[PDB]
Ligand binder design. Structure first.
Ligand code: BEF
Ligand code: BEF
Ligand SMILES: [Mn+2]
Ligand SMILES: [Mn+2]
Length: 128
């Protein structure tokens, strides 16, 4: 994928954002911004430029399922890749997110290999 692709990484806790930012760096993506909830995220996204979203689920103000839904229902960003990265591991949660249009779904805790594999699966599916 284009190493200039701009990422938005969303989670209400810094620890996970920091893990993801560093992994993306390892992979060669340095264009990376962070948000703390779904509202914060939409704000940054509306500022334009983003090519990929990685997002947590449980967050105040707007959770990640709502953020995913919002993104997919906006005409300007409806096809934006959205990778869920979350502690929610129940099959019903995965169904809900998949049905809502998730590009992928990774369960915390995750290894560096898992994140890289799931990211690449999305690249390949979208011809990126
Ligand atoms: F807070 Be997340 F859903 F792990
Ligand atoms: F927008 Be969803 F994928 F129906
Ligand atoms: Mn924090
Ligand atoms: Mn959270």
């Amino acid at each position: 994928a284009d190493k200039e692709l701009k990422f938005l990484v969303v989670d209400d806790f810094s620890t996970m954002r920091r893990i993801v930012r560093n992994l993306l760096k390892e992979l060669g993506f340095n264009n990376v911004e962070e948000a703390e909830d779904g509202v914060d995220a939409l704000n940054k996204l509306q500022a334009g430029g983003y090519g990929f979203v990685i997002s947590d689920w449980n967050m105040p103000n707007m959770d990640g399922l709502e953020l995913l839904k919002t993104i997919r229902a906006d005409g300007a960003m409806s096809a934006l890749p959205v990778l869920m990265v979350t502690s929610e591991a129940k099959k019903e949660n995965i169904i809900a997110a998949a049905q809502a249009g998730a590009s992928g779904y990774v369960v915390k805790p995750f290894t560096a290999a898992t994140l890289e594999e799931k990211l690449n699966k999305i690249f390949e599916k979208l011809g990126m």
